[PDB]
Design a protein around this ligand. Structure first.
Ligand code: NA
Length: 182
């Protein structure tokens, strides 16, 4: 019909999820740390991008810091998620970049961009050594390397419990979104 004719001439990618995908995303949309398990890579990716956009939109509305890092475990996945997914979906609203490993610096992409696609190793190197976990409001972990990052998170949670006891400000920690297909 008339609606269908128009839709057939509407080329921009769309980020409307199926109801099942919405159901499994819901706790992440509410800001809860969670794992999402989906049956396809394309589905997992679309859900990740939707959650990232929702997250950053809410932070902007609330005048709170918003910055997403997406961690993968292969250099080729960095360029894929950057150029084929997050950039085409969100470039209208957010500064997206992929960094895998020559002039571009990881600490500087963290300062200047809103969605950073990188490897777990690069984050871990920047952390275990320029960058802090608190810099990010959301960390998306593909195929949920990660033991050290997770220990680091948990230790900051423990440290925050001490800071609270001491009537000192806590250090902000990101929401964690783990993905697995499937
Ligand atoms: Na799916």
């Amino acid at each position: 019909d008339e609606e269908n004719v128009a839709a057939r001439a509407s080329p921009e990618p769309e980020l409307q999820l199926r109801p099942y995908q919405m159901e499994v995303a819901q706790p992440a949309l509410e800001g809860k740390n969670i794992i999402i398990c989906l049956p396809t890579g394309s589905g997992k990716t679309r859900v990740a991008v939707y959650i990232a956009k929702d997250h950053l939109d809410k932070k902007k509305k609330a005048s709170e810091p918003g910055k997403v890092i997406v961690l993968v475990n292969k250099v080729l996945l960095v360029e894929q998620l950057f150029r084929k997914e997050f950039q085409p979906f969100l470039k209208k609203w957010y500064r997206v970049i992929g960094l895998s490993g020559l002039k571009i610096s990881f600490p500087e992409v963290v300062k200047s961009c809103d969605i950073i696609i990188s490897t777990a190793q690069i984050l871990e190197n920047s952390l275990l050594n320029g960058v802090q976990l608190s810099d990010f409001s959301l960390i998306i972990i593909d195929e949920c390397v990660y033991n050290n990052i997770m220990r680091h998170y948990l230790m900051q949670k423990l440290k925050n419990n001490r800071l609270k006891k001491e009537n000192k400000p806590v250090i902000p920690l990101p929401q964690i979104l783990g993905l697995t297909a499937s």
